[PDB]
């Protein structure tokens, strides 16, 4: 999150997280992010779920294009730069930078 | 014949719609689970 350098939207950077413990309460209760959309699981009660792996795909866009990042949507960025699975189980976080 | 990609070119005076936004998508993969949650505690009484 606090990483200084982010790649382009078409060059979205992917990281793998495993063998650790994740506290999503701090992220959810931060107020510094204007985008908190969790699909598949509730935004809260994430502390009761344990998974094998976590994939973090980070990039930067302009505000007008923050809408297209969601299942079942269409748009320039989604279709040509970063397309996501329709039935993914995860959460998208974003904030003005 | 046109170059496929274009530059946003962000400026300090950007509008709310055109202002830059950082986006991170966290996808959880499960198929032995390795990353678990925090499960709080209390005090002991005897």
């Amino acid at each position, epitope marked *: 999150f606090n990483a200084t350098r982010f790649a382009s939207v078409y060059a979205w950077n992917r990281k793998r997280i495993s063998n650790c413990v994740a506290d999503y309460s701090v992220l959810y209760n931060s107020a510094s992010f204007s985008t908190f959309k969790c699909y598949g699981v509730s935004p809260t009660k994430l502390n009761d779920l344990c998974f094998t792996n976590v994939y973090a795909d980070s990039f930067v866009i302009r*505000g007008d294009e923050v*809408r297209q990042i969601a299942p079942g949507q269409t748009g320039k960025i989604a279709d040509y730069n970063y397309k996501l699975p329709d039935d993914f189980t995860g959460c998208v976080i974003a904030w003005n930078s | 014949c046109y170059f496929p990609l274009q530059s946003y070119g962000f400026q300090p005076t950007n509008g*709310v*719609g055109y202002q830059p936004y950082r986006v991170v998508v966290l996808s959880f993969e499960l198929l032995p689970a390795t990353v678990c949650g925090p499960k709080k505690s209390t005090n002991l009484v005897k």
Partner: nanobody, 120 residues
């Protein structure tokens, strides 16, 4: 054809209250949704609250929930933001935006000079 003017800002102590006004002029019938957003110097835009004029549904930023209340007066053609239990984080310029539809943050426009609120 639509104008929004913000007023009611000022300097208050922590825990104080202010009541900010968004007076609309022109043919505002098309704009069903009205939102209040704020910007501090260093930081970017954020929407504190939004309201649907026809339905009455409202949305609030997690930080402001409980302390802020959004209301409208049709006769005044004004949307009001009530700030209670003001906090230093609340300090920034406040403006009201308006749009036909609520899917996106841009369709809101027509926001005025804004009002400064400082909590110290």
């Amino acid at each position: 054809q639509v104008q929004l003017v913000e007023s009611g800002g000022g300097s208050v102590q922590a825990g104080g209250s202010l009541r900010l006004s968004c007076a609309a002029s022109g043919y505002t019938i098309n704009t069903d949704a009205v939102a209040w957003f704020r910007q501090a110097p260093g930081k970017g835009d954020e929407r504190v609250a939004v309201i649907y004029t026809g339905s009455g549904n409202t949305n609030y930023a997690d930080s402001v929930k409980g302390r802020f209340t959004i209301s409208q007066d049709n006769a005044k053609n004004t949307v009001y933001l009530q700030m209670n239990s003001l906090k230093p984080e609340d300090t920034a310029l406040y403006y009201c935006a308006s749009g036909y539809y609520g899917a996106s943050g841009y369709d809101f426009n027509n926001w005025g000079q804004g009002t400064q609120v400082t909590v110290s």
